[PDB]
Write an enzyme that holds these catalytic residues in place. Structure first.
Site, PDB file in Angstrom:
ATOM      1  CG  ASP A 186     -51.528  11.682  31.272  1.00  0.00           C
ATOM      2  OD1 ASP A 186     -50.395  11.852  31.763  1.00  0.00           O
ATOM      3  OD2 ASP A 186     -51.848  12.136  30.151  1.00  0.00           O
ATOM      4  CG  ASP A 201     -55.391  11.861  26.370  1.00  0.00           C
ATOM      5  OD1 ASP A 201     -54.764  10.997  27.022  1.00  0.00           O
ATOM      6  OD2 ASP A 201     -55.065  13.073  26.329  1.00  0.00           O
ATOM      7  CG  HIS A 229     -49.793  11.673  23.310  1.00  0.00           C
ATOM      8  ND1 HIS A 229     -49.009  12.318  24.244  1.00  0.00           N
ATOM      9  CD2 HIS A 229     -50.074  12.591  22.357  1.00  0.00           C
ATOM     10  CE1 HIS A 229     -48.829  13.572  23.874  1.00  0.00           C
ATOM     11  NE2 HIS A 229     -49.465  13.763  22.732  1.00  0.00           N
ATOM     12  CG  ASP A 233     -50.583  14.955  31.488  1.00  0.00           C
ATOM     13  OD1 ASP A 233     -51.774  14.814  31.850  1.00  0.00           O
ATOM     14  OD2 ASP A 233     -50.232  14.817  30.298  1.00  0.00           O
ATOM     15  CD  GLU A 242     -48.168  10.087  28.116  1.00  0.00           C
ATOM     16  OE1 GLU A 242     -46.952  10.065  27.829  1.00  0.00           O
ATOM     17  OE2 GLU A 242     -49.056  10.072  27.246  1.00  0.00           O
ATOM     18  CG  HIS A 260     -52.854   8.149  28.306  1.00  0.00           C
ATOM     19  ND1 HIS A 260     -53.381   9.114  29.137  1.00  0.00           N
ATOM     20  CD2 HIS A 260     -53.381   6.971  28.715  1.00  0.00           C
ATOM     21  CE1 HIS A 260     -54.188   8.544  30.014  1.00  0.00           C
ATOM     22  NE2 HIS A 260     -54.206   7.244  29.780  1.00  0.00           N
ATOM     23  CG  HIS A 283     -53.925  16.790  28.049  1.00  0.00           C
ATOM     24  ND1 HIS A 283     -52.906  16.362  28.878  1.00  0.00           N
ATOM     25  CD2 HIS A 283     -53.547  18.006  27.584  1.00  0.00           C
ATOM     26  CE1 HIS A 283     -51.956  17.281  28.911  1.00  0.00           C
ATOM     27  NE2 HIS A 283     -52.322  18.288  28.135  1.00  0.00           N
ATOM     28  CG  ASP A 331     -54.842  12.886  30.659  1.00  0.00           C
ATOM     29  OD1 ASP A 331     -54.086  13.880  30.623  1.00  0.00           O
ATOM     30  OD2 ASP A 331     -54.724  11.890  29.915  1.00  0.00           O
TER      31      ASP A 331
HETATM   32  N1  ABH Z   1     -54.741  17.745  22.948  1.00  0.00           N
HETATM   33  C1  ABH Z   1     -53.331  17.715  22.545  1.00  0.00           C
HETATM   34  C2  ABH Z   1     -52.456  17.125  23.679  1.00  0.00           C
HETATM   35  C3  ABH Z   1     -52.939  15.727  24.106  1.00  0.00           C
HETATM   36  C4  ABH Z   1     -52.060  15.194  25.242  1.00  0.00           C
HETATM   37  C5  ABH Z   1     -52.127  13.665  25.241  1.00  0.00           C
HETATM   38  B1  ABH Z   1     -51.846  13.025  26.688  1.00  0.00           B
HETATM   39  O1  ABH Z   1     -52.881  13.316  27.528  1.00  0.00           O
HETATM   40  O2  ABH Z   1     -51.746  11.662  26.556  1.00  0.00           O
HETATM   41  O3  ABH Z   1     -50.683  13.517  27.227  1.00  0.00           O
HETATM   42  C6  ABH Z   1     -53.181  16.922  21.258  1.00  0.00           C
HETATM   43  O4  ABH Z   1     -54.149  16.384  20.763  1.00  0.00           O
HETATM   44  O5  ABH Z   1     -51.983  16.820  20.663  1.00  0.00           O
HETATM   45 MN    MN Z   2     -53.202  11.315  28.543  1.00  0.00          MN
HETATM   46 MN    MN Z   3     -52.275  14.300  29.653  1.00  0.00          MN
HETATM   47 ZN    ZN Z   4     -49.241  11.968  26.434  1.00  0.00          ZN
END
Ligand code: ABH
Ligand code: MN
Ligand code: MN
Ligand code: ZN
Ligand code: ABH
Ligand code: ABH
Ligand code: MN
Ligand code: MN
Ligand code: MN
Ligand code: MN
Ligand code: ZN
Ligand code: ZN
Lengths: 313, 313, 313
Positions: free
Chosen positions: C228, C124, C137, C230, C273, C97, C122, C120
């Site tokens: 995303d 992000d 990401h 997830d 992802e 992402h 998350h 998502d």
């Molecule tokens: N908040 C966590 C996980 C973020 C996940 C990123 B995503 O949404 O792209 O999978 C971090 O900053 O490492």
């Molecule tokens: Mn993401």
């Molecule tokens: Mn995510």
């Molecule tokens: Zn990710």
């Protein structure tokens, strides 16, 4: 008291996979009659309809096994009309959904004013000319709609058929795999439906509120519930011929039937497409049959909140 | 700040399967205390209540292990009242649900005006005379309701008991397997409930709106949440003694508890029926414990939208 | 007619697991282009962006692979702006992402008035200073928000970046694992979101009603959907790097995208992802890819109720 008339319909020639003829068998050994009796239900078993084997039955254009299918429904229609004449709710334990032609037909002979609720992942409204598979389990509704008379050619085995319901007398619940021509028919005839999109948008509660108000609008009338096991997600009823992901949940399945029961108007029920031979494991078969049974019991009074007799416990 | 009082309740004699006494153990090794501290929670562990072994404890009519059960709850009630006297929210990590008798009893000694929210697939309101199984985990609510006094015979081990709540001070959420007599009691005493049918009809959002308005209607008051792990679907909490299909989802479970937390009125919590020995595999146990923990953390502030401290990040 | 511009983005250096670069590959072999064409879609493949390998790319403070990530997004931004200049909806089949930085950036160069819907688990939105993992990401949104300019240090590889959207031009759907600083940013900048809690409370129907009214309030405008994988529950899309339980269902996923399509305003799409190498079995990979595809097709017209052409069937 809800009096039922059990009709075993071991038929499969409406689609390619034969294990579906075992539906009546596994549902009865699952204790369906016993469990229905364990409720204040008056149950009469009319048995498994011995279906005629028609060796000479070549396709009609693309349509497969028309005479076998047309005969099985003609037979079933007669019986259904018999149990209805006996003041009982017909419970068709079927094989494939092509039998709906005979089930709804026989029902309408006795109660020409019935309304139909069709729970399915499919519309099953292809015509002999719109079908691309040629399988009759995906065409039953087209044979029953009056507005479609003149669009259905004389198919061998169905001369006895006569469209008994109008496009506005039916409601679909659960749709998620509709063919293009089927969609055109929906929009053109103005058929009321709740695809998985409307279920997601409104919730099964509102969906049922609207369905019952739509059918029992101007007046109370007998209700025919044709339940296709694949209307529920394959995680609940995996042992079926045409499974489609993103289906109705177990809870929504029971909610649907619980609401139907409470109207006191159920007069015809179809529990179709359970095919034990299509389960990947012994428990996938068990999961399918059990769900099928649970839905059946809900149609006849079993409620999740509980049940009690008119006595002081 | 939400101050908690951990009370390990390793008891199982309220039902036949013994693995449930391990609940406190596996929930603590799952890091429950640590994770609660990882939040702005003031945590005090009162330990695992050493329960009295009562070798001479024959059935009372049909009721099994009454003296053992009655004693365990009498003991638990004392402790619960102790942590409440210490200005902390009691967190009972239990074994079987029969312990609710002692948990709610001790809670009410300190806050006689509490309201109870009971999340369960069952009503657990059978009386010694209505129960057909004789297991006390399915009878706790009957010992606590004032209106039922005169319908509960003097059962050995419960002379210390005194009904502390009225039928209108309790709300059920999740019901899907209620016995006939239990249903009669519901309707007769006018107990407010949301079976899986009402959850399906209204949505967990409205369900919680109505539950809290029902209990905190005329005035704010301490809330007692007795959470039976089997209130959630067996796909989330499989390692439990009496699982029932079509349960509350993981999301609904967290929504329930998140809404409770936000009231700021939670004063008593029961996390019951986790039985690690009943998981078919190592991960079914892990799935059950993790869900149980997640629900617990939600009761004390953990929100899915996120959490942040009063500082400029 | 909805004209699409396919952009393969085989990149993984925004997070630790490399299998995500295979997303474009498995999604194309799943028949994505073919299936989109099977709809009335005008499809043009711009190919898999050959990404620059940057051997010398040490961390910036805690931030890992900044130059590789900053370059991949700079590259992607150029292409995206190219397909937009060609009157086509950009379809970014991604890896991690972090690429959202380049995707939304290039989109905004051509349509500075776009609104973004971010599905998502998350947010992000971690900044190089709030991130604790150092993985990019989980930081893309922080590089795009104007209000956060002055809080993002000059990170190697992103000098070309210029915040293109305001905090009120974005809506989150699906949140369930937000870090503390991320939460503070949400509340402080007043970003509109629907965590799993709001989805549970309101239903995906109301959630979508509010999201679209929030973004297309004062005027219709191009919509950028950054999806995303997830955001959906791991039972549907297990083959992804940061799975979180209690996610959006398959149905909600399709409902989201079906509603977006119907606005006729979708102009930018991110399918990110999917990491086939993270599936525990061959079918977990198949389940993930198929769901990803289904969501993609829904964004471009495929409806569960059915579809038909402007002809008399
Ligand atoms: N908040 C966590 C996980 C973020 C996940 C990123 B995503 O949404 O792209 O999978 C971090 O900053 O490492
Ligand atoms: Mn993401
Ligand atoms: Mn995510
Ligand atoms: Zn990710
Ligand atoms: N529409 C497809 C599948 C129909 C499925 C039929 B049913 O609903 O009975 O399973 C066909 O016409 O072959
Ligand atoms: N109603 C049954 C089962 C009760 C289940 C008790 B519980 O909810 O604690 O698991 C009985 O009385 O034995
Ligand atoms: Mn079907
Ligand atoms: Mn069907
Ligand atoms: Mn229970
Ligand atoms: Mn219980
Ligand atoms: Zn069929
Ligand atoms: Zn129990």
């Amino acid at each position: 008291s809800r009096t039922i008339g059990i009709i075993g319909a071991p038929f499969s020639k409406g689609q390619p996979r034969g294990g579906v003829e075992e539906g009546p068998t596994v549902l009865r050994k699952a204790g369906l009659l016993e469990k229905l009796k364990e409720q204040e239900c008056d149950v009469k078993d009319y048995g498994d309809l011995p279906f005629a084997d028609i060796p000479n039955d070549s396709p009609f254009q693309i349509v497969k096994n028309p005479r076998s299918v047309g005969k099985a429904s003609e037979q079933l229609a007669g019986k259904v009309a018999e149990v209805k004449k006996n003041g009982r709710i017909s419970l068709v334990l079927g094989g494939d959904h092509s039998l709906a032609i005979g089930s709804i037909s026989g029902h309408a002979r006795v109660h020409p004013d019935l309304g139909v609720i069709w729970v399915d992942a499919h519309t099953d409204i292809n015509t002999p000319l719109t079908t691309t598979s040629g399988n009759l389990h995906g065409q039953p509704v087209s044979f029953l709609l009056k507005e479609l008379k003149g669009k259905i050619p004389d198919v061998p085995g169905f001369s006895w058929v006569t469209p008994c319901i109008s496009a506005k007398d039916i409601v679909y619940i659960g749709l998620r795999d509709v063919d293009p021509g089927e969609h055109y028919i929906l929009k053109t005839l103005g058929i009321k439906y709740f695809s998985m999109t409307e279920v997601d948008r409104l919730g099964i509660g509102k969906v049922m509120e609207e369905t019952l108000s739509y059918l029992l609008g101007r007046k109370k009338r007998p209700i025919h519930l044709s339940f296709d096991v694949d209307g529920l997600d394959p995680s609940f009823t995996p042992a079926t011929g045409t499974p489609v992901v993103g289906g109705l949940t177990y809870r929504e399945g029971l909610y649907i039937t619980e609401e139907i029961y409470k109207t006191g108007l159920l007069s015809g029920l179809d529990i179709m497409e359970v095919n034990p031979s299509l389960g990947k494991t012994p428990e996938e078969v068990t999961r399918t049959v059990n769900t099928a049974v649970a839905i059946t019991l809900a149609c006849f009074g079993l409620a999740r909140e509980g049940n009690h007799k008119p006595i002081d416990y």
